[PDB]
Amino acid sequence: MRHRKSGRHLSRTSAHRKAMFQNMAVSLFEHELIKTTLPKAKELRRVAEPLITLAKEDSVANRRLAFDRTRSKAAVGKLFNDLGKRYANRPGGYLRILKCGFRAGDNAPMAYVELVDRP
């Protein structure tokens, strides 16, 4: 059973899962609109949205907490210089998951992940 459990395995180890969603969130902050599978996009919400919430308060400790969770200097800079100020009055929901069709190669359900204010 998985009664009341959260998270998706995605046929990965937890190390690879952690590494992938940190890669995806970094990519999303750089490009502001990415395409991925619908299961990955729905689990990317729980990783990338707490990072924007953290970026609203600019401090040395918050920036270090951001860097531990992204390991990307560019992503940390974008979160506190642009995205943290842009979503200051937005109470969550910084991402938008829009379903596109299916991948040609394997018929995988696709989704668009865009930042809400401007993609």
**Contact footprint for Mg ion (CB under 5 A):** 6, 11, 15
In the list RNA, another protein, Mg ion, none, the entry touching 27 (Cβ below 5 to 8 angstroms by class) is none
87 and 110 Cβ atoms separated by less than 8 Å: no
Q: Considering the complex, what minimum distance in angstroms separates the CB of residue 71 from Mg ion?
A: 12
- Asked if residue 61 binds RNA (CB under 7 A), the reply is yes
Cα(55)–Cα(106) distance, integer angstroms: 37
Cα(43)–Cα(50) distance, integer angstroms: 12
Task: Determine which helix (DSSP H) or strand (DSSP E) holds 81, and give its type and residue range.
Answer: none
The end-to-end CA distance of the chain, in Å, is 39
Q: Which lies closer to Mg ion via its Cβ, residue 21 or residue 87?
A: 21
The closest of 6, 11, 35, 59 to 112, measured between CA atoms, is 35
Binding letters toward another protein, positions 67-86, x by CB under 8 A: --------------------
- Of 19-27, 49-57, 72-80, 111-119: span binding another protein (CB under 8 A): 111-119
Q: What would the DSSP string read from start to end of 101-113?
A: EE-TTT-PEEEEE
Binding site for another protein (CB under 8 A): 1, 3, 33, 98-101, 112, 114, 119
Binding site for RNA (CB under 7 A): 1-15, 18-19, 37-40, 42, 45-46, 49-50, 53, 60-61, 64-65, 67-68, 71, 73, 90-99, 105-109, 116
